[PDB]
Structure formats: structure tokens, C-alpha cells
């Protein structure tokens, strides 16, 4: 047989990238996965090169980043690429996730595929946050303070886990140095998790926009999808280029250009845009313990979808009620984000509380109810007795 088939190493590449049978009808929404691998590489590469010039000590961290910005040849390109890359990493991840939601990609027999993806999402949030703390700006310090304190909510030992995590009395030199060590480690765990994601994808293959079987008409990954992936890879790079060279700080916060100060918290704190929806959910619960539990639940609830989707067909392509509600969910998520950027003031607090309700209700009430109703409608519209 061909060498690409017989060689122990090449056959892996052949089965995953060259001869892999793809459903002839997949659309550009299926291009986000490769875009996610690309993002992972860009983050690792630019990160290692900057690590060569970075100092983790609390007295030097901020200045070492400035050193990367002012003295390292092409240093600012590395930092703006790494920083803006993290944002682009989340924009693409949400689209990857939303695509799965809309087409019922989370359904059997791809449950394992969906669950591993949830784990990756969590690991990515943890990674970006740790990286954020390495700049040691004003936002960095308080973020490191808030997130680590999240654990004090645990009864009895909670405050202990916290002083442990800090390695002292407060967010200090033992904190930022362990955060750097950890920021370097986690990306390699994501890589291993990405491999398990791909292994799970390979056993049943990709789904398609029609939601039905692809077994009757497949075309090779090689040529068709390699070249189609190239189209979005270049588009992705063009847009990232525009931010990196023309508007490098639009997705950041001015407060991070101010060194961290243990005694003063900024008058207006607005977290990273991709964390805003979660920040709003946290803020909407006037109880400490319940506040953190509901926030974590906002992520874990994604695990419930394979069971609450009562439909008999996969995906929202041929479903009027489901498409409509799908978009209520999308814009509700954006709203939550907008609320997160506002002050805890009158019309906003109640709006935040209702939006949070709607978010959870989609998974637990709307989907099961709507899918059941749609099942029946499909039946009585054709049976004549």
C-alpha cells in the first residue's frame, strides 16, 4: 500500500488529515476547529519567546514586560500577538461552541466529544487568567486576589486553601511566581486534552448541517477541506493583524499599564470581555457562597444538554421554535456581558438577575419543553388517523 498508509507515524497523519472521510455538505462553521489549533500554536510560540526575557519576581514582573515592549527586537509584536491572540482564541471558541449547540453536535454518539470540550474550555479560562496575572498591573493584582478568594466560599477549610494558594498573607511574591510557573504548564495539558478531543471525534466522525448521516456521500479531507481551511486561516490572520498593528490595546484595560498596588483598588473595574458574562452572573447573587456556586454552574450546565434535548432529530436546521429560542439564548448571553461592564445600579441589577434566570432556563426548561412540542407537531402534521 502507499507509504503514507504503512508507516507507523504517517498513517496517523493520513487517517486524521489526508484520507479522513468528511460529509460532503459541511459548511464554514466546521472550520473553527482548525482555527482553534492555530490559536493554540500562536499562543505557545509567542509565549516561549517572551519567557526568554520575562522575570516573575513581583518587583520586576511589570518592568520586564515593559522591557519586552521597549528593548526586545520585535518585542511589542510578540506581546500584542500573545495578548490579542488570547482574545481571538475566545471569540473562535464561542463560535465553535455555539456551532455545536445549534447543530446538536453534543448529541449521542458524540457525548464524550462534547464533555472533553467542556474540560478544555475550563482549562483555557484558567490559563488566560494566570497569564493575565503575570503582567502584574492593577487589574492583574485584584484579579489574582478575587479569583483566589473564590475558594474561601468553601466551608471550614476555605480560607486555608486560600492562604495556601497565596503562599502567604496576601497576593505577593510567592503568588505571581507560582502563577507564572503554572501559566507555562497548563497549555501543554490543553494540548493533550485536544488530542483526546480529536480521538473522540475520529470514532464517529463529524456531523453535518442536515443533522442526518454522512455515510452515503463522503469526500477526502485532503484537498477539499485542507484548502477550504486555508481560506479562513488567512481571514483570521488578516483581522488579527489589524488589531496587532493598528489597535493593539482596544481589547485590553488601561489600568494594566499601572503597576499593581496592594493598598488601592481602581474605582472602576471591568474584567476581560470574555469573562464579563460570568462576572455579571456572580454579581447578581447577593450571597457569597451562592454567588460562586451559580457562576461555576453556568459552565457545568453545558453537560446537561445531551439529556434535556428531547428531540428525535439532530440540530435546529428544520426547527422553527428551536431556532428562535437559540437566538434568544445568544443575545441574552451578549446582554449579560453588557451588564457586566456597567455599574451595580438600578435598572442593571434587575436586568442582570432576569438574564441569569433566562440563561439557566434555556438548558433546563425551554429546550426540553420546546423539543417535546416540536416532536408532536412533526407527528400530527402527517399522520391521518
Amino acid at each position: 500500500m502507499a507509504f503514507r498508509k504503512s508507516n507507523v507515524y504517517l498513517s496517523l497523519v493520513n487517517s486524521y488529515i489526508i484520507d479522513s472521510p468528511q460529509p460532503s455538505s459541511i459548511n464554514y462553521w466546521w472550520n473553527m476547529g482548525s482555527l482553534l489549533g492555530l490559536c493554540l500554536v500562536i499562543q505557545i510560540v509567542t509565549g516561549i519567546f517572551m519567557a526568554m526575557h520575562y522575570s516573575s519576581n513581583i518587583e520586576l514582573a511589570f518592568s520586564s514586560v515593559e522591557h519586552i515592549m521597549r528593548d526586545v527586537h520585535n518585542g511589542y509584536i510578540l506581546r500584542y500577538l500573545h495578548a490579542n491572540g488570547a482574545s481571538f482564541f475566545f471569540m473562535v471558541m464561542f463560535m465553535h461552541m455555539a456551532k455545536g449547540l445549534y447543530y446538536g453536535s453534543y448529541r449521542s454518539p458524540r457525548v464524550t466529544l462534547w464533555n472533553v470540550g467542556v474540560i478544555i474550555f475550563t482549562l483555557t479560562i484558567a490559563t488566560a487568567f494566570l497569564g493575565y496575572c503575570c503582567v502584574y498591573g492593577q487589574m492583574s493584582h485584584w484579579g489574582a486576589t478575587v479569583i483566589t478568594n473564590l475558594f474561601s466560599a468553601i466551608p471550614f477549610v476555605g480560607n486555608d486553601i486560600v492562604s495556601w494558594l497565596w503562599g502567604g498573607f496576601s497576593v505577593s511574591n510567592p503568588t505571581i511566581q507560582r502563577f507564572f510557573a503554572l501559566h507555562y504548564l497548563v497549555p501543554f495539558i490543553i494540548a493533550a486534552m485536544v488530542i483526546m478531543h480529536l480521538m473522540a471525534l475520529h470514532i464517529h466522525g463529524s456531523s453535518n448541517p442536515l443533522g442526518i448521516t454522512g455515510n452515503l456521500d463522503r469526500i477526502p479531507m485532503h484537498s477539499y477541506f485542507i484548502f477550504k481551511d486555508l481560506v479562513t486561516v488567512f481571514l483570521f490572520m488578516l483581522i488579527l493583524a489589524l488589531f496587532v498593528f493598528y489597535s493593539p490595546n482596544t481589547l485590553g484595560h488601561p489600568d494594566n499599564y499601572i503597576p499593581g498596588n496592594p493598598l488601592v483598588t481602581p474605582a472602576s473595574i471591568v474584567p476581560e470581555w470574555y469573562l464579563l458574562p460570568f462576572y455579571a452572573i456572580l454579581r447578581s447573587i447577593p450571597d457569597k457562597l451562592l454567588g460562586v456556586i451559580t457562576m461555576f454552574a453556568a459552565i457545568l450546565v453545558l453537560l446537561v444538554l445531551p439529556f434535556t434535548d428531547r428531540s428525535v432529530v439532530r440540530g435546529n436546521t428544520f426547527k422553527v421554535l428551536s431556532k428562535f429560542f437559540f437566538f434568544i439564548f445568544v443575545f441574552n448571553f451578549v446582554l449579560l456581558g453588557q451588564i457586566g461592564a456597567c455599574h451595580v445600579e438600578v435598572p442593571y441589577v434587575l436586568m442582570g438577575q432576569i438574564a441569569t434566570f433566562i440563561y439557566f432556563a434555556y438548558f433546563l426548561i425551554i429546550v426540553p419543553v420546546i423539543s417535546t412540542i416540536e416532536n408532536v407537531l412533526f407527528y400530527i402534521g402527517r399522520v391521518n388517523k
Binding site: 500500500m1 498508509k5 504503512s6 508507516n7 507507523v8 498513517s11 493520513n14 487517517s15 484520507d19
Partner: protein, 93 residues
Amino acid sequence: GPPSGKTYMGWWGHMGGPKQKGITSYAVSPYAQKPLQGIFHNAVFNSFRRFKSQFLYVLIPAGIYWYWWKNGNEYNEFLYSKAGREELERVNV
């Protein structure tokens, strides 16, 4: 899945060996055997045998290298002592 290349090892039921016939194996459960203590009296003089056949292949090359090392060392010591400072100027540069 994709077709796999031919190897020299299979798996249980199709390992790749030749067809066996005529051979009969017998075994007794480890549970029914004498608790580990009989590895003496019967299994002691038999031991050490798998090194009486090998030590020569190890000893001779070792011996050769040990004497070579000892010789050159003792020569070095002499060269840098008082007695050898004369021969040292001869062999040195």
C-alpha cells in the same frame, strides 16, 4: 478504520506463529503451591551457576583495563615526583 501495515506480531488468537500441534502444557495454581520458602536447599547450589559461565567474559576485559589504568597512573605519579622530574622534561613537550 484505515488499513494497517503488515508486522511480525499479531494479537491473542492470531499472534503470527506457526500452527502448533502435539505440544501439551500443564500447570498448578500458585495457591496450591508451597509458600515461598523452598527456594533454598533445592534452589541454592543450583543458583550462582549463571555467572560461573559468564564471569570470564567480564573479568578478563575488566582485568585488562584495570592494569592498563593502574600502570598509567603509577607512571604519572612518578613523573611528577622529584625522582622523575628528569624523565618528565624528556616525555613532556
